[PDB]
Amino acid sequence: MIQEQTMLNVADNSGARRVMCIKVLGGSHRRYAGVGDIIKITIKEAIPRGKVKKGDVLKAVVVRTKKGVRRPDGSVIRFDGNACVLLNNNSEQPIGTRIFGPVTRELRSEKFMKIISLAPEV
Amino acid sequence: SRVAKAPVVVPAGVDVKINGQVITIKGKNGELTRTLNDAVEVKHADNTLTFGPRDGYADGWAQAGTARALLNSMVIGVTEGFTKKLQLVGVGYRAAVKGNVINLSLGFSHPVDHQLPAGITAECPTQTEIVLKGADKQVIGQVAADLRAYRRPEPYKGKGVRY
Amino acid sequence: MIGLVGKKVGMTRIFTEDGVSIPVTVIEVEANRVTQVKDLANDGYRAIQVTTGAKKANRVTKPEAGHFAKAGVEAGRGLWEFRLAEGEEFTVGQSISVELFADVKKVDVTGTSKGKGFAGTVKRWNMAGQMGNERVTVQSLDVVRVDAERNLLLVKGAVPGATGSDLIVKPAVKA
RNA sequence: GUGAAGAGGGAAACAACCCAGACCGCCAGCUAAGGUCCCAAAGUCAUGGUUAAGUGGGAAACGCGGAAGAU
RNA sequence: GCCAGGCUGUCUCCACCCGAGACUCAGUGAAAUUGAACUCGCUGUGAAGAUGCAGUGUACCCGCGGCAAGGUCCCUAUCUGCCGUGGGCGCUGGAGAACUGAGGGGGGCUGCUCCUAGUACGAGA
RNA sequence: GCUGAAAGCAUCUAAGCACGAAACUUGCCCCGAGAUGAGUUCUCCCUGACCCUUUAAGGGUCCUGAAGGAACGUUGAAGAC
Numbered sequence: 001m002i003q004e005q006t007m008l009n010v011a012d013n014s015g016a017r018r019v020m021c022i023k024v025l026g027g028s029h030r031r032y033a034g035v036g037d038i039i040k041i042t043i044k045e046a047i048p049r050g051k052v053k054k055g056d057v058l059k060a061v062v063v064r065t066k067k068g069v070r071r072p073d074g075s076v077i078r079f080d081g082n083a084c085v086l087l088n089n090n091s092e093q094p095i096g097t098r099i100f101g102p103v104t105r106e107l108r109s110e111k112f113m114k115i116i117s118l119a120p121e122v
Numbered sequence: 123s124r125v126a127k128a129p130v131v132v133p134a135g136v137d138v139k140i141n142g143q144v145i146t147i148k149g150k151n152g153e154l155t156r157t158l159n160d161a162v163e164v165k166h167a168d169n170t171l172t173f174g175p176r177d178g179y180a181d182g183w184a185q186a187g188t189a190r191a192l193l194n195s196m197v198i199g200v201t202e203g204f205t206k207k208l209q210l211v212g213v214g215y216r217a218a219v220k221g222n223v224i225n226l227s228l229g230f231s232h233p234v235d236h237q238l239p240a241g242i243t244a245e246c247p248t249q250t251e252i253v254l255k256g257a258d259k260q261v262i263g264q265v266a267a268d269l270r271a272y273r274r275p276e277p278y279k280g281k282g283v284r285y
Numbered sequence: 286m287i288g289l290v291g292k293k294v295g296m297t298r299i300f301t302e303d304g305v306s307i308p309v310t311v312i313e314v315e316a317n318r319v320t321q322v323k324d325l326a327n328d329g330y331r332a333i334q335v336t337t338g339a340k341k342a343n344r345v346t347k348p349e350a351g352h353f354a355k356a357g358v359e360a361g362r363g364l365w366e367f368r369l370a371e372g373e374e375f376t377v378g379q380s381i382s383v384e385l386f387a388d389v390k391k392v393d394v395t396g397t398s399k400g401k402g403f404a405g406t407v408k409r410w411n412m413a414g415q416m417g418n419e420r421v422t423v424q425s426l427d428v429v430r431v432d433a434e435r436n437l438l439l440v441k442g443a444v445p446g447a448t449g450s451d452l453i454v455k456p457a458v459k460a
Numbered sequence: 461g462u463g464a465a466g467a468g469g470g471a472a473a474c475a476a477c478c479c480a481g482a483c484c485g486c487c488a489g490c491u492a493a494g495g496u497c498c499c500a501a502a503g504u505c506a507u508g509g510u511u512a513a514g515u516g517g518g519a520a521a522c523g524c525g526g527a528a529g530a531u
Numbered sequence: 532g533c534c535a536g537g538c539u540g541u542c543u544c545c546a547c548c549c550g551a552g553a554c555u556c557a558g559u560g561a562a563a564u565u566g567a568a569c570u571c572g573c574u575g576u577g578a579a580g581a582u583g584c585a586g587u588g589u590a591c592c593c594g595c596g597g598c599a600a601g602g603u604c605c606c607u608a609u610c611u612g613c614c615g616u617g618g619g620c621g622c623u624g625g626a627g628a629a630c631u632g633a634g635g636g637g638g639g640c641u642g643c644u645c646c647u648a649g650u651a652c653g654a655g656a
Numbered sequence: 657g658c659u660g661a662a663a664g665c666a667u668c669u670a671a672g673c674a675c676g677a678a679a680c681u682u683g684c685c686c687c688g689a690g691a692u693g694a695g696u697u698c699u700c701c702c703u704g705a706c707c708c709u710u711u712a713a714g715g716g717u718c719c720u721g722a723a724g725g726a727a728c729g730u731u732g733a734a735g736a737c
Binding site: 320321323327329330346348349350351352353354395399400402403415417418419420421422423424446447450458459460 | 683684685686687696697698699700701722723724733734735736
Binding site for chain 5: 320321323328329330332334346347348349352364365366403404405406407409410411412413414415
């Protein structure tokens with residue numbers, strides 16, 4: 001999961017390496033964020049021509065949670081760390097066409113119909 | 123005042139009884155009763171109904187005129203009845219009628235159903251035209267106003283329910 | 286249809302065939318015997334006073350023994366009221382099963398929460414106070430499973446009280 | 461003039477507002493200011509008028525309005 | 532003297548546990564203050580925020596547990612007010628149970644999508 | 657808003673005479689008859705004797721000790737006590 005000033009990993013070829021949370025959206029005066037929640041993150045380290053430069057402010061979504069998330073059948077699928085993929089307010093389609101690691105089955109939302117195609121590993 | 127000085131002719135088949143301040147009128151449609159204000163005196167006045175303001179009331183003339191108008195309306199109702207016609211202007215505005223409830227659909231996600239007071243008959247010669255027959259003008263007017271309030275005449279196309 | 290008094294036993298998750306296991310609290314509802322009927326003529330309002338369970342001979346006071354004898358019911362460990370639905374009254378000595386809740390799908394659970402020790406000023410007023418052991422009614426609870434031949438009720442979520450605590454289940458009047 | 465150094469009654473309370481200068485006592489009466497629906501003792505008193513708004517029961521200048529006042 | 536990095540409940544939010552107090556049992560036991568106290572709220576006046584003066588409302592008597600409104604950041608939280616829980620007492624012979632209820636308390640928030648519907652309306656937008 | 661003048665028009669009202677805002681209250685649930693206005697219902701127990709006075713919401717003596725509670729032990733998901 002996410003908290004104030006959380007450290008997030010990167011699961012796309014956008015060039016981001018270290019992304020740090022700044023604000024939490026999806027509810028006024030909200031505390032934390034979930035896997036199926038929109039979070040506000042910025043970048044700390046970028047490749048020579050990374051899509052994100054230091055101090056950037058743009059949305060993102062967590063695909064993997066270190067704390068773990070639940071399922072209706074009691075499954076508590078959890079990962080070694082927090083992985084987040086950047087999103088934009090306009091042109092939601094993320095630049096990265098490749099996602100590292102598996103993804104859960106909760107990405108069946110209206111806007112997440114184009115991400116389930118990616119991530120061949122489940 | 124001026125309207126009060128006008129006895130109203132009661133046609134045949136209408137029975138009028140003055141029990142003190144109460145006026146009871148009977149006719150073909152059915153019974154009707156109405157408690158009259160004490161500020162005006164009404165006598166039988168066979169074939170008519172004379173109204174006289176009571177001494178000591180400043181509002182006597184207007185009260186007598188209103189009572190005369192109401193008695194005339196009641197007489198005209200009982201003798202023949204009152205009819206009102208309402209049109210529904212607009213596409214998809216239905217006026218289905220069943221039992222003692224009028225169902226209307228004027229663009230709302232739910233039907234609007236209005237109960238019919240006893241003694242009021244609703245008919246639909248055309249699906250978009252609704253006719254109400256009643257012995258009392260007040261009841262028919264109130265039901266018509268309730269139907270009209272569901273969809274106000276739209277002041278860009280003149281849609282809704284209109285008289 | 287009408288409120289029944291039962292005893293909390295435990296809570297678990299009932300695994301559904303579609304992997305949607307739901308938290309279910311388990312209530313044992315023995316056949317509650319209607320001890321008395323409170324009517325408008327005598328008691329001033331419509332209701333039934335009911336009991337359930339068994340009482341030890343020493344535990345039954347002679348006034349209570351006479352009350353049960355008049356009621357023609359076995360001495361139950363507790364007595365409770367249940368307001369009728371202005372439909373009809375019950376007869377003295379009538380045992381009510383759990384079939385009434387078999388076709389409700391929405392019930393409210395009233396009970397006393399687990400007691401908690403000394404609640405200091407910070408815990409109470411943020412003088413001191415206490416929390417727990419208070420009769421509160423959690424509403425809008427849908428019954429999951431009903432077993433009349435076993436007197437077993439499974440209700441969604443959680444209910445006040447620990448194992449063996451007495452509680453009441455009533456029709457979900459509030460929605 | 462009062463308090464200072466004068467009690468007491470009234471103004472709901474109150475020392476400078478009105479009446480009124482206590483020798484002590486007695487279960488009598490008459491007055492001053494103030495009251496006579498009650499609390500709280502007295503007319504729910506007689507006659508001639510204003511009041512329809514609780515203005516009485518807080519308010520100026522100004523054309524009944526002006527008018528907005530303290531847990 | 533400065534910078535970059537790793538580094539912990541300082542925090543989001545704190546949750547439980549370990550030893551001494553905080554509470555009771557048997558015994559020791561002093562304090563600052565003290566005119567006497569049958570030591571309520573609100574409105575108004577008062578050498579000017581009244582527990583004590585005029586009006587009004589509430590409250591059975593007495594105990595146990597403290598938040599504290601009354602650069603030693605001093606002055607027993609003694610006493611007023613405050614919630615929970617107790618001892619005595621009356622509901623009219625006594626007692627055990629189930630309750631109606633005069634009244635009091637709590638919260639009554641809010642984003643997105645779907646059918647209506649790209650519909651009424653709208654020259655079109 | 658149905659008829660509707662006074663004041664041959666008109667008008668929410670003068671007579672007849674109807675809806676309606678999340679604003680207010682019930683309705684949602686908890687405490688609550690110390691509510692001294694001290695409330696309602698069910699059940700159970702006591703069915704003795706004698707003496708005196710200031711002779712009546714009187715007093716005293718012998719016997720009786722009902723239901724219930726508390727007294728103490730095991731103790732609890734009940735509690736600082």
